[PDB]
Ligand binder design. Structure first.
Ligand SMILES: *[C@@H]1O[C@H](CO)[C@@H](O[C@@H]2O[C@H](CO)[C@@H](O[C@H]3O[C@H](CO)[C@@H](O)[C@H](O)[C@@H]3O)[C@H](O)[C@H]2NC(C)=O)[C@H](O)[C@H]1NC(C)=O
Ligand SMILES: *[C@@H]1O[C@H](CO)[C@@H](O[C@@H]2O[C@H](CO)[C@@H](O[C@H]3O[C@H](CO)[C@@H](O)[C@H](O)[C@@H]3O)[C@H](O)[C@H]2NC(C)=O)[C@H](O)[C@H]1NC(C)=O
Ligand SMILES: *[C@@H]1O[C@H](CO)[C@@H](O[C@@H]2O[C@H](CO)[C@@H](O)[C@H](O)[C@H]2NC(C)=O)[C@H](O)[C@H]1NC(C)=O
Ligand code: 7RC
Ligand code: 7RC
Ligand code: NAG
Lengths: 282, 131, 282, 99, 131, 99
C-alpha cells in the first residue's frame, strides 16, 4: 500500500477549495452570530461538525443559523462518506514493484549499497559463468560467494527467500517459472536479456539442407503454428493476472504518515506555546 | 487514456425522490410525536429530526414523552442504516467505475470484431501487412 | 438489491447477543447506581452510543463505569465499521435475475396471471407455429395477439420493449445471440430445449454412403474437432455474459425494508401510547 | 434433487443418447420414426416433466458469505473478559472513593 | 461450497503491536496535553482524549489554550484516520474474501496438473472412458 | 520517450531483426560470426543501453484515478443556497416576531 495513500484522496483542488470554504463559512458564521469573542470557538465547532462531536461547546445561537450549521453538517457527512469510499478503493491492489529492468540495473553494480545486501546468485561452471566473468568481472568476484549446487537448490532458496534473485539460462528459467507451484517466480525483461541468442538446429558444415531447413522454420514461424506448439509444450501454466493479494495489516511502515503528523503537531504546538509565552506583556 | 472517475453530483448514489420522501417522513414523524402528548416542542422536534439524521451537534434537550425514547432509538437505527447505505454504495460505485479495457492483445474482441467506431490500421507494404 | 439485504450481513445470533450485552451492561450500571436518574434512560444512552453520538444524553454516572461506557463505545465503533464493510461486500453482486427457466414455465402456460401479462413472441407461419399449434392451442391463441414480422423486427421489438421473450429455431437463435452488437440478450437453460431436434445431412434413400458418413461424423465428434469448429464459427468472444453492473440510484423497492420497519415502529409507538393511556394512573 | 451438489463446466462432447440394437434386426427405421414422432408431439416433454424436472431447487444468486457467530461472537467473550477487570476496578474504587 | 466470511478477530485489520502503539500514544498525548497546562486535572483531559478516539460523548474535560486546541484538532483528525483505515481495510478484506470458485471447465489448467490435492475420476469402461 | 502513448497486449510473432544481403555475397559467414561475437562480448549490451534504454520519462502501475474538481463540484453549489437564507434574516422578524 502506498505510504502517501491517505493524501491520495486529497488533490490540491479539493484541499484548497475545502480549506477556503472553511475560512469563509467561519467568517459568515461568526458575523451572523454577532447578531445572534466567541468567533474563535465557531471554528472549533465547524471543524468538529466536519469530524464529529468533540466536546460540549456553544453551538446553539441564531436559530435560523442552525439551518446553515445543519447544511454544513450535511456537507460534512458527504465529505466523510467520500473519504471512506475513496480510501477504500485506494488500498486494494497488487503491486509488482518492477524491481529490475534488466541485469544492467544499478542495483546489481552496487549490491552493498542496499540494506539488507542484495543476495543473487548463479550456477557456477557453466557458460553463464564464463559470460558473466568476461563481461562483468567485479560482478563475478562478488558472485564467487553466491554459487548454488543445483537448479532445484536455487529454486527452493527463491521459494523461501534465501536468495533475492537468480541468474541462469533464460528458457529453462521460463520453463521452471511456468510449472512452479503458486507462480511465486517471475521472469523479467520480455526478451531484454544480455547476450540475447536463440536455440536452434545444428547441421553438418556446408550441408545442402541449410536452405530447406531455414525456409521451413521461417514458414512455421510466420503462419503461427510455432507459438501453438509453444503453448502446447511451454509455460501456458500460470500466466495469470495478479489482481490483488490480501492487503495485510496496514503497518507502521505503511501508515507512518500518521506518526509524522503527530510529530509535526508536537513541534507546531511547542512553537505556538513559545510564541504565546512571548506575548505575555499585554 | 487519462483515467477519470465519473460522479454527476452528490445525487449520483441516491434517487432524487429519496431525499424528498425522507425529508417529508421525518417531518411527519416529528409532528406525530409533537401532537399526541398534550391531550392526557416543535422547534426541538425539528432540530432532533434534522440533526439526528445528519449527525450534527444541534439539539440539546430531550423529548418529553416516554415512547419518544423508542421513536428516537428506531430513528437512530434508520440514520445508521441510511448513512451506511450511502457509504457502501459510494464505495462500490467508486471501485467499479474503472475505464474500459485497454485492448487485451491479438485476441481482443474490439480487434477480433471490426467496428467502424474503433478503426485501426498499420503501415502499407510492410512486414506486418504481409503477416 | 434485496429489500431486506441490510439484515443478511449479520447472523441473528449476534444480532441478539448485542442486545443481551446491552442488558448486562445496563444491569452493571444500575447496580453501580444502587449504592446511592438515568435508570430509564441508560438503555437510551447505550443505544445512542451504539449507533451515533448525535443525541443529547444524561451521561455522567459512575466514573468507574465510564470506563465501561468507553468500552461500549469501542464495541460500537468496531460494530459500525464491520456493518459498513459487510454492507459494502453485499453490494458488488454480479447481475443475475433470470425470468425464464423453460417453455413449460407457469409464466408461459399462464400468461395472463401477471400484471402486465407475460408477453412472449414467435414468427407466425413458421414450423414453430405448427408445433405450438399442434401441442398447445391455448398459448398459441394467446400468441395470435403478439404476431411478429421478422428476425431483426423481433430483435428491435425486444430491444424497444415491444416484446419480452421470443420463440424461434434454436441454432439461429444462438448464432444471433453470440453475435449481438453488445450481447445485451440471453438464451435459455444453456441448452435445455423444448421439442429438441438436430441439424444433419440429407442422403438418398438407403444409399451405401450413409454408413460411411455416419462413422465419419461420429469420428470427428470423438476426435474433438467439432467443438473448436463451432467455437471458431457460430460462437462469439463476448458470447458468455457481461460482468457485474453498478448499483444504480437506490430504488424505494430496494430500500423498502426500512420503510416497512418504520411502519411497524409507528404502529408499536401507537400501541405503547394506548398502553400508557390505560396505565397513566401510576 | 440434492441441491448441495452443483454442476459446472460448459457442455463439451455435445452428443445424444440412443437405444442401440443389432445391425440386421429390422425395427431400426420404425424405431427412429417413432422416436421422432414422440419428439414432435411433446410426449418426450411429458416424460421430461414426469422424470427429469419436477422439483427444481436450483441455487441462484450466490451469497457473498455473510458474517455469523464465529468471528464476532467470541469477541463478545473477549470483551466479556474486560468486564471481569471492571469487577476489580469497582472494588478498587472502594479503596479509592473512601478518602 | 457454503458461503461464510472467515475471520479470526477484530485484530485482523491491524497488528496487535500497532494496537499497543496507539494505546500508548493516546495516553502519552493526553499526558502531554495535561502537562502543557503549566503556562496555559489529568483525569479530565485523559478521559477526554481516550474518548475522542472512541467517539463516546462522555467527558467534559476540555483544553483552554490554543496549542492544546490545535492538538485536539489534529487528534480528532488522527482518530478518524484510524477509523477510515479500519473500515477500508475490513471492506477490502471482506470483498476479496471467499474468492474460491468451482472449475469452469476441463480447459482449466488445474485439471492439467494431477495431484492428490486435485483428484477427478469417472466410471470405468464408460463412454467418457474410451473418449 | 514521451509518456503520451502506451504499448498494450502480449507480444506475438517473435522474429529477429537481421542484416539482409544478396545470396551470392561472400560476406555472409563473417557477418554472422561478427554479429554473434558482438552479442557475446557485451557490445550489444552497451549499444542497447546507449540507444534503447533512455527511459527519460516512465509511467507504470496506473493509479486508481483519485477524485477531482467536477465530480463533486456541484456539491459546493448547494452551500451557496445557504447564503440566500442569510439575507432572509430581517424578514425573520416579519416572519415570527410579528406573528
Ligand atoms: C414398420 O412400420 C410399417 C408401417 O407403415 C409397417 O408396414 C406395414 O406393415 C403392415 C403389416 O406388416 C402392412 O399391413 C398389411 O397387412 C396385411 C397382412 O400383413 C396385408 O395383407 C395388407 O395388404 C397390408 O399391406 C402395411 O401395409 C405396411 N405399410 C407400409 C407403408 O409398409 C412395417 O411392417 C413395420 N416394420 C417393422 C419391422 O416394425
Ligand atoms: C572472414 O574473416 C576471416 C578472419 O580470420 C578471414 O580469414 C583470414 O583472412 C585473411 C585475409 O582476409 C587470410 O589471409 C590470406 O590472404 C592472402 C590474400 O592475398 C592469401 O593469399 C593468403 O593465403 C593469406 O592466408 C587468411 O588466410 C584467412 N584465414 C583463414 C583460416 O582462412 C576470411 O578470409 C574472411 N572471409 C571473408 C569472406 O570475409
Ligand atoms: C566446478 O568445477 C570446478 C573445477 O574448476 C570444481 O572445483 C573443485 O571444487 C572442490 C570443492 O567442492 C574442490 O575440493 C576441488 O579441489 C576443485 N577442483 C578443481 C579442479 O578446481 C567444482 O567441484 C565444480 N563444481 C560443480 C558444482 O560442478
Ligand atoms: O545447448 C546447451 O548445451 C544447453 C546448455 N544449457 C546451459 C545452461 C546454462 P549453464 O551452462 O548450465 O550454466 C542451457 C540450454 N542449452
Ligand atoms: O431444416 C430447415 O428447413 C430449417 C428451417 N428453419 C425453420 C425456421 C423457423 P420457421 O420455419 O420460420 O418457423 C430452421 C432451421 N432449419
Ligand atoms: C404469413 O405472415 C405474413 C406476415 O409476416 C402475412 O403477410 C401472410 O399473409 C401470412 N400468411 C399466412 C398463410 O398466414
Amino acid at each position: 500500500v502506498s505510504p502517501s495513500a491517505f493524501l491520495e484522496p486529497f488533490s490540491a483542488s479539493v484541499w484548497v477549495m475545502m480549506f477556503v470554504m472553511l475560512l469563509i463559512v467561519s467568517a459568515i458564521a461568526v458575523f451572523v452570530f454577532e447578531y445572534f469573542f466567541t468567533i474563535g470557538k465557531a471554528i472549533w465547532l465547524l471543524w468538529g461538525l466536519v469530524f464529529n462531536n468533540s466536546v460540549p461547546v456553544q453551538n446553539p445561537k441564531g436559530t435560523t443559523s442552525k439551518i446553515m450549521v445543519s447544511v454544513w453538517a450535511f456537507f460534512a457527512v458527504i465529505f466523510l462518506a467520500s473519504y471512506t469510499a475513496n480510501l477504500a478503493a485506494f488500498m486494494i491492489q497488487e503491486e509488482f514493484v518492477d524491481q529490475v529492468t534488466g541485469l544492467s540495473d544499478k542495483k546489481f553494480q552496487r549490491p552493498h549499497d542496499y540494506s539488507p545486501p542484495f543476495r543473487f546468485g548463479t550456477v557456477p561452471n557453466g557458460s553463464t559463468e564464463r559470460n558473466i566473468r568476461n563481461n562483468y568481472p567485479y560482478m563475478h568476484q562478488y558472485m564467487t560467494r553466491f554459487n548454488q549446487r543445483g537448479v532445484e537448490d536455487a529454486l527452493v532458496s527463491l521459494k523461501t527467500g534465501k536468495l533475492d534473485a537468480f541468474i541462469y539460462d533464460a528458457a529453462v528459467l521460463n520453463y521452471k517459472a511456468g510449472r512452479d507451484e503458486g507462480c511465486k517466480l517471475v521472469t523479467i525483461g520480455s526478451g531484454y536479456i544480455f547476450a540475447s541468442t536463440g536455440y536452434g538446429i545444428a547441421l553438418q558444415k556446408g550441408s545442402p539442407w541449410k536452405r530447406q531447413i531455414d525456409l521451413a522454420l521461417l514458414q512455421f514461424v510466420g503462419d503461427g503454428e510455432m507459438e501453438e506448439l509453444e503453448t502446447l509444450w511451454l509455460t501456458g501454466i500460470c500466466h495469470n493476472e495478479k489482481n490483488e493479494v490480501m492487503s495485510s495489516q496496514l503497518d507502521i511502515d505503511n501508515m507512518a504518515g500518521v506518526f509524522y503528523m503527530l510529530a509535526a503537531a508536537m513541534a507546531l504546538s511547542l512553537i505556538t506555546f513559545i510564541w504565546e509565552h512571548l506575548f505575555y506583556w499585554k | 487514456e487519462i483515467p477519470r472517475s465519473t460522479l454527476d453530483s452528490f445525487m449520483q448514489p441516491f434517487q432524487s425522490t429519496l431525499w424528498l420522501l425522507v425529508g417529508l417522513s421525518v417531518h411527519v414523524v416529528a409532528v406525530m410525536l409533537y401532537l399526541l402528548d398534550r391531550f392526557s416542542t416543535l422547534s426541538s422536534a425539528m432540530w432532533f429530526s434534522w440533526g439526528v439524521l445528519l449527525n450534527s451537534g444541534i439539539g440539546e434537550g430531550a423529548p418529553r414523552s416516554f415512547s419518544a425514547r423508542i421513536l428516537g432509538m428506531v430513528w437512530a437505527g434508520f440514520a445508521m442504516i441510511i448513512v451506511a447505505s450511502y457509504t457502501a454504495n459510494l464505495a462500490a460505485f467508486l471501485v467499479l467505475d474503472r475505464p474500459e479495457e485497454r485492448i487485451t492483445g491479438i485476441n481482443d474482441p474490439r480487434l477480433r470484431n471490426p467496428s467502424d467506431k474503433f478503426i485501426y490500421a498499420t503501415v502499407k507494404q510492410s512486414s506486418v501487412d504481409i503477416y | 438489491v434485496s429489500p431486506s439485504a441490510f439484515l443478511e450481513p449479520f447472523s441473528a445470533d449476534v444480532w441478539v447477543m448485542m442486545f443481551v450485552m446491552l442488558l448486562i451492561v445496563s444491569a452493571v450500571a444500575v447496580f453501580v447506581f444502587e449504592y446511592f436518574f438515568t435508570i430509564g434512560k441508560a438503555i437510551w444512552l447505550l443505544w445512542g452510543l451504539v449507533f451515533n453520538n448525535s443525541v443529547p444524553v444524561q451521561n455522567p454516572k459512575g466514573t468507574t463505569s465510564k470506563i465501561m461506557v468507553s468500552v461500549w463505545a469501542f464495541f460500537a465503533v468496531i460494530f459500525l465499521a464491520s456493518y459498513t464493510a459487510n454492507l459494502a461486500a453485499f453490494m458488488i453482486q454480479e447481475e443475475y435475475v433470470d425470468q425464464v427457466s423453460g417453455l413449460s414455465d407457469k409464466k408461459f402456460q399462464r400468461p395472463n396471471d401477471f400484471s402486465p401479462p407475460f408477453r412472449f413472441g414467435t414468427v407466425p407461419n413458421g414450423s414453430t407455429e405448427r408445433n405450438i399449434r399442434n401441442n398447445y392451442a391455448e398459448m398459441h391463441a394467446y400468441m395470435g395477439k403478439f404476431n411478429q414480422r421478422g428476425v431483426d423486427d423481433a430483435l428491435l421489438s425486444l430491444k424497444t420493449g415491444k416484446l419480452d421473450a421470443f420463440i424461434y429455431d434454436a441454432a439461429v437463435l444462438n448464432y444471433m445471440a453470440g453475435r449481438d452488437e453488445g450481447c445485451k440478450l440471453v438464451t435459455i437453460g444453456s441448452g435445455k430445449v423444448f421439442a429438441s431436434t438436430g441439424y444433419g445431412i440429407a442422403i438418398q434413400k438407403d444409399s451405401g454412403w450413409k454408413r460411411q458418413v455416419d462413422l465419419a461424423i461420429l469420428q470427428l465428434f470423438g476426435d474433438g474437432e467439432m467443438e473448436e469448429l463451432e467455437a471458431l464459427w457460430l460462437t462469439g468472444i463476448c458470447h458468455n455474459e457481461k460482468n457485474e453492473v453498478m448499483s444504480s440510484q437506490l430504488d424505494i423497492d430496494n430500500m423498502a425494508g426500512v420503510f416497512y420497519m418504520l411502519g411497524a415502529a409507528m404502529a408499536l409507538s401507537l400501541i405503547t401510547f394506548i398502553c400508557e393511556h390505560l396505565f397513566y394512573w401510576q | 434433487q440434492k441441491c448441495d451438489l452443483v454442476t459446472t463446466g460448459e457442455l463439451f462432447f455435445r452428443s445424444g443418447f440412443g437405444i442401440g440394437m443389432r445391425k440386421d434386426s429390422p425395427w431400426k427405421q420404425n424405431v427412429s420414426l417413432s422416436i421422432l414422432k414422440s419428439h414432435e408431439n411433446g410426449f418426450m416433454e411429458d416424460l421430461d416433466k414426469t422424470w427429469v424436472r419436477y422439483q427444481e431447487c436450483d441455487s441462484r444468486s450466490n451469497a457473498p458469505a455473510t458474517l455469523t457467530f464465529e468471528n464476532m461472537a467470541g469477541v463478545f467473550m473477549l470483551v466479556a473478559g474486560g468486564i471481569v477487570a471492571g469487577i476489580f476496578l469497582i472494588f478498587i474504587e472502594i479503596a479509592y472513593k473512601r478518602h
